[PDB]
Design a protein around this ligand. Structure first.
Ligand code: HEM
Ligand code: HEM
Ligand SMILES: C[C@]12C=CC(=O)C=C1CC[C@@H]1[C@@H]2C(=O)C[C@@]2(C)[C@H]1CC[C@]2(O)/C(O)=C\O
Ligand SMILES: C[C@]12C=CC(=O)C=C1CC[C@@H]1[C@@H]2C(=O)C[C@@]2(C)[C@H]1CC[C@]2(O)/C(O)=C\O
Ligand SMILES: *[C@@H]1O[C@H](CO)[C@@H](O)[C@H](O)[C@H]1NC(C)=O
Ligand SMILES: *[C@@H]1O[C@H](CO)[C@@H](O)[C@H](O)[C@H]1NC(C)=O
Ligand SMILES: *[C@@H]1O[C@H](CO)[C@@H](O)[C@H](O)[C@H]1NC(C)=O
Ligand SMILES: *[C@@H]1O[C@H](CO)[C@@H](O)[C@H](O)[C@H]1NC(C)=O
Ligand SMILES: *[C@@H]1O[C@H](CO)[C@@H](O)[C@H](O)[C@H]1NC(C)=O
Ligand SMILES: *[C@@H]1O[C@H](CO)[C@@H](O)[C@H](O)[C@H]1NC(C)=O
Ligand SMILES: [Mg+2]
Ligand SMILES: [Mg+2]
Lengths: 240, 240
């Protein structure tokens, strides 16, 4: 049971911390996480992701504790902290620029155009369109960023993020790996749950067993290859 | 106010969780951390390390949050969880065996002999002896472990651990980078604060600024070289 009327969307104020993740930013914009985007713990993320999206603790504990590395605090982050390049934040994002050549934090409409224009002739994004977008975004980074980092780990994270927008913003069973364009576009562009537009929280739990085959299929269709060393080493904290 | 007399050493029972770290095990054995070694958060580690050893939050937050990755819980570990190979736990330990050829968890006297016999003719261990021990322990792993991992990261972690025993178990200013053998031996062999033997908590804070030059000097004197892969990629969670 969750009451979305008790969780209205509100635009972030000037002192509200927001990060590179539309998932967490949207939860904050609805007060499932603190609207100020600060002093956020893994337990808070677990609860917020469950209440807002029906995303389960398996993925949120795993990703959450990696995310905690990005702050200087014992057990919390600000959402903006997650911009730390090379922990989770990576090149060839769907809606942000690469840090070496631009802003790796804020939503960018020109970057988002690739996703927005994907799956022409359908009213949904799906696994094949998501894979094509990942292929095109990586090619863009390889072309324009001489410092691009593209590893097994970044590629897996990227497919996980695509799987997230396909599942959390779904109309039908998230298993199907497709989501209305109208829902996904609001998610990214406004960091809002598209309630007025007809979206409802999944009644099916979204967990690693559900996401895994979607992730693997997106990767397979994306015609991916590693770059350089292919070293999957994360940055372990800020300012090292 | 911290009262060391209210923190007696007690040997762990068979179901009290202990890990590969003598620093955290000793805090547990004195009740600065829970004696059962479970349900331990980074704030708890920060407070325990301050109270017991005068180790500051900078290093304990950084290491603590990496250590949290080893459990399946949102914000706690058991001490035994820290044995997870390739997060922090590494080959060429001072007092444990390499996981591929033995027990990477428990104190082992035969391994410890190298450290115990270091700095002949003196009643202290110091930076040069610590470096010699690291050189010899790595050589042992290269000789006997077909799955040996030796990277910049493991080498740095090893120097950090040597810097910890030299500073936390010091008699004089921890700056000096030397510790009585009688104190360090009790620390490793019994995971006890050597209070009866004359040890007292440092009155000087032990933080990254203090440890950094000690760590770097231990590395430099150890005649360390890359041997293979050199990708400092940590394991991000259990059972992946
Ligand atoms: C709650 C469900 C979640 C959803 C639905 C979600 C969704 C997404 C999506 C779609 C992106 C890609 C943005 C892009 O490429 O432009 C993303 C990026 C990101 N997410 Fe999440 N996320 C969730 C949870 C988390 C958690 C728990 C963390 C914890 C650290 C996190 C950290 C990030 C980071 C750092 C990025 C930036 C990666 C990059 O594009 O460079 N997310 N998220
Ligand atoms: C800050 C939180 C801490 C975490 C998460 C942590 C974790 C660990 C881990 C996982 C190991 C095993 C590495 C290996 O040898 O394979 C280790 C070793 C060690 N730790 Fe800690 N530690 C912490 C704090 C401390 C403190 C405060 C001290 C102070 C005494 C300390 C001293 C040591 C020493 C001397 C070793 C080396 C043991 C050996 O090589 O046999 N640690 N630590
Ligand atoms: C992408 C992800 C999930 C969504 C997100 O926004 C941030 C992250 C960062 C950590 C990722 C995580 C996963 O989805 C699971 C990953 C990708 C993990 C690191 C390795 C991992 O645990 C794995 O090897 C199997 O999935
Ligand atoms: C080993 C350590 C501590 C324990 C742990 O589980 C994880 C790490 C990784 C990063 C280490 C950190 C330190 O303790 C301080 C170090 C070693 C740092 C990298 C360089 C460093 O910041 C330094 O002081 C000298 O270069
Ligand atoms: C909350 O975060 C701020 C930084 O935004 C930090 O100064 C403060 O100590 C944090 N509080 C905790 C311990 O949760
Ligand atoms: C990119 O790599 C070059 C070396 O190839 C380096 O000199 C430069 O500083 C890097 N730039 C960034 C932004 O990391
Ligand atoms: C995605 O939709 C397009 C257009 O409707 C279709 O051609 C394609 O086969 C779909 N892919 C998947 C994986 O369903
Ligand atoms: C673990 O610690 C938390 C926080 O103090 C507490 O609420 C919980 O009940 C504890 N669990 C156990 C098994 O003791
Ligand atoms: C360590 O002690 C030995 C023996 O007393 C001495 O020869 C050596 O120079 C010392 N090294 C340092 C760094 O103090
Ligand atoms: C360890 O090394 C042996 C011998 O080279 C090899 O057969 C085995 O697969 C290795 N195991 C690991 C942990 O990779
Ligand atoms: Mg990015
Ligand atoms: Mg070890």
């Amino acid at each position: 049971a969750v009451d979305f009327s008790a969780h209205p969307w509100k635009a972030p104020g000037p002192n509200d911390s927001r990060g590179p993740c539309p998932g967490l930013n949207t939860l904050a914009n609805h007060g499932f996480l603190p609207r100020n985007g600060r002093n956020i713990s893994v337990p808070m993320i677990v609860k917020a992701g469950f209440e807002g999206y029906n995303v389960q603790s398996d993925i949120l504990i795993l990703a959450g504790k990696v995310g905690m590395l990005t702050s200087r605090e014992a057990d919390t982050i600000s959402l903006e902290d997650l911009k730390l390049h090379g922990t989770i934040e990576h090149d060839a994002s769907l809606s942000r620029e690469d840090v070496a050549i631009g802003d790796n934090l804020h939503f960018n409409e020109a970057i988002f155009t690739t996703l927005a224009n994907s799956n022409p002739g359908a009213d949904v994004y799906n696994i094949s369109s998501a894979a094509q977008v990942q292929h095109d975004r990586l090619a863009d980074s390889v072309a324009r960023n001489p410092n691009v980092t593209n590893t097994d780990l970044t590629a897996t994270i990227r497919s996980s993020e695509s799987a997230f927008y396909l599942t959390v913003m779904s109309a039908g069973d998230p298993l199907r790996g497709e989501a209305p364009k109208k829902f996904v576009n609001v998610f990214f562009q406004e960091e809002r749950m598209p309630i007025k537009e007809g979206w409802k929280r999944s009644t099916t739990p979204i967990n690693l067993p559900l996401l895994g085959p979607i992730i693997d299929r997106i990767t397979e269709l994306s015609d991916w290859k590693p770059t350089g060393d292919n070293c999957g080493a994360i940055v372990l904290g800020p300012g090292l």
